[PDB]
Amino acid sequence: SELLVNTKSGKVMGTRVPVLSSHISAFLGIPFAEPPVGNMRFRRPEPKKPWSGVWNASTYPNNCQQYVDEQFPGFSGSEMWNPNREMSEDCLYLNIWVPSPRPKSTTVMVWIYGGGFYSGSSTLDVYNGKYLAYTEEVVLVSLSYRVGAFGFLALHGSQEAPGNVGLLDQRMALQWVHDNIQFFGGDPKTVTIFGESAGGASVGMHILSPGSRDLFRRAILQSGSPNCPWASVSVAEGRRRAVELGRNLNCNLNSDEELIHCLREKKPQELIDVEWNVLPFDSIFRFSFVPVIDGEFFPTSLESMLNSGNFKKTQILLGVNKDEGSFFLLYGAPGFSKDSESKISREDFMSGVKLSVPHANDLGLDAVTLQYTDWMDDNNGIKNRDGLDDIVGDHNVICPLMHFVNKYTKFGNGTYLYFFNHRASNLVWPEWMGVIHGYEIEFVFGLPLVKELNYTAEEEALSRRIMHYWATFAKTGNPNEPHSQESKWPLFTTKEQKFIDLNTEPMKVHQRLRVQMCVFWNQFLPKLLNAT
Amino acid sequence: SELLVNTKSGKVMGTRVPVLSSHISAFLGIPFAEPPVGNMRFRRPEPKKPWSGVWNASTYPNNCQQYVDEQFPGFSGSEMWNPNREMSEDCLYLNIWVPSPRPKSTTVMVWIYGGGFYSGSSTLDVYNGKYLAYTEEVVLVSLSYRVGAFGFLALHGSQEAPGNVGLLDQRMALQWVHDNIQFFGGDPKTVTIFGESAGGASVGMHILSPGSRDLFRRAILQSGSPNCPWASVSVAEGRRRAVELGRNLNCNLNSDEELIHCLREKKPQELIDVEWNVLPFDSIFRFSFVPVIDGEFFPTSLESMLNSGNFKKTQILLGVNKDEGSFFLLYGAPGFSKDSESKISREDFMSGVKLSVPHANDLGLDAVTLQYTDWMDDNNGIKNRDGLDDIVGDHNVICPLMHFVNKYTKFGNGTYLYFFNHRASNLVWPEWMGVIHGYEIEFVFGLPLVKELNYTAEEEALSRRIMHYWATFAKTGNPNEPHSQESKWPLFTTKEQKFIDLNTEPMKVHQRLRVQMCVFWNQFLPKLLNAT
Numbered sequence A, B: 001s002e003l004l005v006n007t008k009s010g011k012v013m014g015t016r017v018p019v020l021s022s023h024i025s026a027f028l029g030i031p032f033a034e035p036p037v038g039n040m041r042f043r044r045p046e047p048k049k050p051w052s053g054v055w056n057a058s059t060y061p062n063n064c065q066q067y068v069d070e071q072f073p074g075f076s077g078s079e080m081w082n083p084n085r086e087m088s089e090d091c092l093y094l095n096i097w098v099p100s101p102r103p104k105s106t107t108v109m110v111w112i113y114g115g116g117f118y119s120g121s122s123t124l125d126v127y128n129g130k131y132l133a134y135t136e137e138v139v140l141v142s143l144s145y146r147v148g149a150f151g152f153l154a155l156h157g158s159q160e161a162p163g164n165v166g167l168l169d170q171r172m173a174l175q176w177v178h179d180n181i182q183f184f185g186g187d188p189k190t191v192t193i194f195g196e197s198a199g200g201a202s203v204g205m206h207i208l209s210p211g212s213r214d215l216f217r218r219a220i221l222q223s224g225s226p227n228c229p230w231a232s233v234s235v236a237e238g239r240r241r242a243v244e245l246g247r248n249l250n251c252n253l254n255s256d257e258e259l260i261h262c263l264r265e266k267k268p269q270e271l272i273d274v275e276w277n278v279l280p281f282d283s284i285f286r287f288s289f290v291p292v293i294d295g296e297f298f299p300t301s302l303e304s305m306l307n308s309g310n311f312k313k314t315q316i317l318l319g320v321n322k323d324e325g326s327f328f329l330l331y332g333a334p335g336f337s338k339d340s341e342s343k344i345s346r347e348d349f350m351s352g353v354k355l356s357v358p359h360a361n362d363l364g365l366d367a368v369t370l371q372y373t374d375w376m377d378d379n380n381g382i383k384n385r386d387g388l389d390d391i392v393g394d395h396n397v398i399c400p401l402m403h404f405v406n407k408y409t410k411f412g413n414g415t416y417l418y419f420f421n422h423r424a425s426n427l428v429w430p431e432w433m434g435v436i437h438g439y440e441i442e443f444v445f446g447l448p449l450v451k452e453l454n455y456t457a458e459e460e461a462l463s464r465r466i467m468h469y470w471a472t473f474a475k476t477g478n479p480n481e482p483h484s485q486e487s488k489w490p491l492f493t494t495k496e497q498k499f500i501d502l503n504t505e506p507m508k509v510h511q512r513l514r515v516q517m518c519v520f521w522n523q524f525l526p527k528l529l530n531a532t
């Protein structure tokens, strides 16, 4: 049977799924680890005990325990990101979409979900791997990993809650793919890991970490890089937040062993309810439990690793969206709201700057304000709104990705950079938010090919073109087909720093993506904060 | 006789001078002070002893002792600024141009020469008052004052060299005008003091200083303001430079009395030869002997005076030129020269920044560089050249004048601001220097009306229009003729901050003159330097 596969862990039984009036196989909900419950909460993942008999892989698994967005109930815009299955701490599963008939050795892509390390599910409609698998004839995997305190509570020195275990969750899933994907027709020699947001930063983290490098071939990063200011913390800061979390739930705090035990007796929701109370500053685009610079997973600091060339050398394809910041300002910054144009007063603009750069002294805050204020027209509500959108996007996502890409290219074997700026015709969010964090994903997964979702024809064409770029890059290390008449996405080089737009218009090459602002975030401001 | 005038100091005999195929009277070389020679070197001026008989006022007087530009011998561009008479320490004289027939009570304008407080003469061709006097029917005075160490050597606490005596030279000349100009047909109630560069800053200084306010009615400032970073020093810094000057000439340094005596035995040229050796930094647009913040002439610091409204309240007309910096970079900055386009390398640009902001730490220098660098095109020789031109202009002249004008307007009785950007058709300096420091003066004094000087017709028209603005403002406090059909130079206000261009094209109003750069020089950078 095409739906029966014998792996090293035991036999799995999948299901036939319809896609664009054809069909393909899906193996959903395969475990790659022992359920991390009870005394194994906060702990490193263990490999899954092999099973006898046939594992039923016909339905999606549980989503990991996580915060649930309730700002706009019934609103698809926010709820498309929420878990669509029951939540459980028993959530370490992966899903596979396989072409029909079964391939022998074809290119593999493994997806890693975003969600600020505090949220995410492999099972969301926008992550459905069937269109990609079917259209490009690739084996599509989607993994899962613990988020929140469950994934990232860090008491360094203690082996009961070391930190980074959600990254090791990802690593164990890549190990399983390495080991077994051949039985599904995947080529273990040609695995591309890709991810958006925290998943993009995760991809970058596996590139850096020695323990992860050998388990994938190449990598795509969407709107995220490992050096993002929100993607990691020192061991001291992690310790502090873990202690404060215990302080919020009335734990004994005299020893690591006392704290951890107390935290293990709590029900999942008690941890989720107080999770946001541990942040050190009044901030946006900051998350409580994130990867920690521990000296095991990351041997030294991220910057010294990037300078010395201490990372996997291979091809990378990556980029950003036009308006990365709007999602975050909407939720947290005064003056912004979903159903108005959100024209921002000068007073709200400055409140905005404070929340967006929480770690900055007064001089730093002035430096930023000056850099994004048009002093000819300082009380223009639209210019204030958009400038603050640009600040949050540049600081959090674009300038950290640009620092990474410039550093990586010095040592790497080929870089391809994009700037995604198509505003989708059917977007439910308001005009002012622009091209939002996470809204390139639907084009990457081929949702525009489904007619009932109401995209234009040129949006279908864009989606196909992006899928073929992504898949051709996974297959060869180059998104272009050599010998074809279409426009050439040029290689990014240290010298010329070229990149393309991704949108419905004929492609354009440009150079030095937001260099004037990123010299400010990546060189000047940090120097200013170190002197003062 | 029309050429004989009886003043309070004694009788004066002038001369009839031809102008634009008519004639007028000129009283040249009238003394207003005792010659400041011998023991009176470095000292406050004394009033001139009245004379019996008739003072011959038919020829220009001596120019004060000063440094003489020799960079381009025979080149009119540089030599038009040099002294055209014999130099002497016996130089305290003034000159008067009077319409024919003699007026009774008409508007008076008294000119104060620039030259960085280290140079200047009342007697230069470009300062010839006859065209202005004749064309607008005003009595035109031009004064003189000691420059260099002779005018500004400052040993505070000592009455032998107190500092600021060159400003008191100006004050005594304004006193003489107050007292006597009526006998020449001038209205002592309607005196306008005007000046360029150090003379513009001087004008501003008489507005601030209590001792000077009552001696003039209103004021014009061209490319200079009292708060310019080069226009004054602390008493400690003045003391240091006076000591270092004495150290350069082998003086006994054990007491003020010893130093001053030693300096008084030296010939003028010995002081001039070592004058530049006392500057604290490697710099441009900085001068050795300048006004000192002494607590007598200036009661408190310039900034506290500007904040509290401690100054004469009256009308002011003022402005700047497009390319104020080029003159200074030519003379002192590596990569610039008179006979090339002076395209500047990135390395020379940074050398430039260091010399232009000599008092800044490394963080400050970076802040400036970032602000004036296009990071898309950082090795564009023209953009580097022009950016450095703009830095020197903005820091030295434009942003300090803009801070002054904004502060003054809060308390003042009417402000009129211009931006002069006509590149003269007959200019001998190269294209790259643009609209240079000091090249609006020729339009103010009417040289374009003389055919043999080879200006265009529209340049004649511009000159006349500027002269009539200047003269109508001196007469009424408003450069416009109410009830006339010509375009209206609008009042500058705290709210709307309006200003005009001065050039051959139809006038345009704009707002907030170089506000984006001047917020940087006047707010951010000083705050950055105070924290670090």
Ligand SMILES: O/N=C/c1cccc[n+]1CCCCCCC[n+]1ccccc1/C=N/O
Residues within 6 Å of the ligand: A067, A081, A114, A115, A116, A117, A197, A276, A283, A284, A327, A328, A331, A332, A333, A437, A438
């Ligand atoms: O961090 N990445 C999140 C993500 C990534 C891809 C797609 C969708 N998202 C949902 C994030 C939008 C809303 C941000 C919500 C942050 N937040 C959560 C809980 C409580 C408060 C807040 C923010 N307060 O300002």
Ligand SMILES: O/N=C/c1cccc[n+]1CCCCCCC[n+]1ccccc1/C=N/O
Residues within 6 Å of the ligand: B067, B081, B114, B115, B116, B117, B197, B276, B283, B284, B327, B328, B331, B332, B333, B437, B438
């Ligand atoms: O300060 N204002 C001077 C002025 C004003 C109106 C018209 C003409 N000028 C001549 C100044 C140009 C050249 C600057 C010369 C400065 N300088 C003098 C002596 C020795 C060295 C230097 C400069 N070295 O970099």
Ligand SMILES: *[C@@H]1O[C@H](CO)[C@@H](O)[C@H](O)[C@H]1NC(C)=O
Residues within 6 Å of the ligand: A412, A413, A414
């Ligand atoms: C990648 O590496 C191969 C083999 O080592 C080399 O020949 C090629 O030039 C490299 N490509 C780039 C873009 O560096």
Ligand SMILES: *[C@@H]1O[C@H](CO)[C@@H](O)[C@H](O)[C@H]1NC(C)=O
Residues within 6 Å of the ligand: B412, B413, B414
């Ligand atoms: C100047 O002062 C006069 C008289 O005090 C006043 O009436 C007039 O409004 C003032 N003008 C300005 C521009 O402030």
